[PDB]
Design a protein around this ligand. Structure first.
Ligand SMILES: CCNc1cc([C@@H](c2ccccc2)N2CCC[C@H](n3cc(C)c(=O)[nH]c3=O)C2)cc(Oc2cccc(Cl)c2)c1C(=O)O
Ligand SMILES: CCNc1cc([C@@H](c2ccccc2)N2CCC[C@H](n3cc(C)c(=O)[nH]c3=O)C2)cc(Oc2cccc(Cl)c2)c1C(=O)O
Lengths: 200, 198
């Protein structure tokens, strides 16, 4: 079994990459694609509170992302890992660290303490970081629409946040150059994963 | 002016909601409510071809919905927006994306390329998504199903969820699992809040 998380800002090609990697890995492995809350009832109820919130306090929001993370981990991820599955998870702890911790300014160490209470030692076996520059990311976000200064600044802070998290911690982390055309990003991600799965 | 579209599967209370919301807004706004083809002659002739179709190829069907969309947009919507009106439109691009693109399996990106040729940059200012769960939706449809109908209804909802997930900025999701009185109220409030910001 393997617990593989995918991290990156919007515009990193993360959705395309997970889907294409899934379609290739399924040939050889019993693989599932998931994201939080991922259909888990309590997590779905938490997701409704977050989405229906009117100017919700950022710490309450962080605690709800963490509660949805736990429910998804306990009721979906852990049972799949027990069945010997390869679990491809779109966003995990590092998303809370980059978004709530860094970009929203709660503090990375504070959001880490919160999320370590939530995951209780269950860190990913491997984390794919889709390393996109703000500029390439911006262009992909514009393309995927129909950006204002606040959106551009928030996108930059998320990227700065991811750079800081990787700078301080890098073992499970494997950074893929997401500035490349998506065909190459998919190939490098697939190769990185196969290399890991073949080391058992 | 404002171009407001309404989207959702059957069983979302969309007909009731748009009709009741239009009845309220018509007291305080220069607003019109329409749907495709909306009486536009070319659109009406296209509608007859779609409705009289015997196992029509899904891509032909998508092109006819997009041709009806253009005629209605050009002859009805654009002139009203030029007069400074609020235009309430029941189903637009997102219906083609969810039904032809996702549920029928042509592909969302392919149906989007087709519809972007049809709308030529005229995306809605605001799209109200009547967010109903498959289960509540099913019950409303029965009140107003075989395995194929149930599966198609679920796919349409999955389709809408995917479109909103990838393009969340344009949409305002209203909880359509609520009694229709509350769905109408939340939609009305969402619209008035938007119109008062510009
Ligand atoms: C366009 C995608 N649609 C959605 C968009 C968002 C959005 C957001 C942030 C704050 C407040 C409201 C909405 N935002 C988008 C980039 C990544 C970000 N994000 C993710 C993770 C995993 C995290 O830990 N921290 C964090 O900031 C979540 C939140 C969403 O709902 C969730 C998701 C997971 C769990 C729950 Cl409880 C609720 C959804 C959704 O429709 O599922
Ligand atoms: C009982 C409701 N009556 C009607 C029901 C339908 C029906 C359908 C689908 C496929 C084949 C045959 C009938 N279906 C109902 C759910 C939404 C769906 N739908 C909508 C839009 C806007 C889209 O883009 N794609 C899509 O799948 C249309 C099509 C209709 O005719 C139209 C409407 C707009 C334009 C034209 Cl050309 C023709 C009508 C009608 O009486 O007007």
């Amino acid at each position: 079994s393997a617990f593989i998380t995918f991290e990156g800002p919007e515009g990193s090609g993360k959705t395309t990459v997970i889907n294409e990697v899934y379609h290739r890995l399924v040939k050889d492995y019993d693989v599932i694609m998931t994201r939080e809350p991922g259909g888990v009832p309590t997590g779905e109820e938490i997701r409704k509170i977050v989405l229906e919130g009117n100017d919700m306090d950022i710490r309450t929001e962080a605690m709800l992302f963490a509660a949805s993370r736990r429910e998804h981990l306990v009721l979906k991820v852990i049972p799949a890992l027990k069945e010997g599955k390869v679990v491809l998870c779109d966003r995990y702890i590092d998303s809370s660290l980059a978004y709530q911790g860094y970009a929203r300014g709660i503090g990375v160490e504070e959001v880490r303490a919160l999320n370590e209470f939530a995951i209780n030692g269950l860190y990913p076996d491997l984390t794919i970081y889709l390393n996109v520059s703000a500029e390439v990311g911006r262009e992909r976000i514009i393309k995927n629409s129909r950006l204002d200064q606040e959106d551009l600044k928030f996108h930059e802070k998320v990227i700065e946040g991811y750079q800081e998290i990787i700078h301080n911690e890098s073992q499970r982390f494997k950074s893929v150059n997401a500035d490349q055309p998506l065909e190459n990003v998919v190939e490098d991600t697939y190769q990185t994963i196969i290399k890991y799965l073949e080391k058992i």
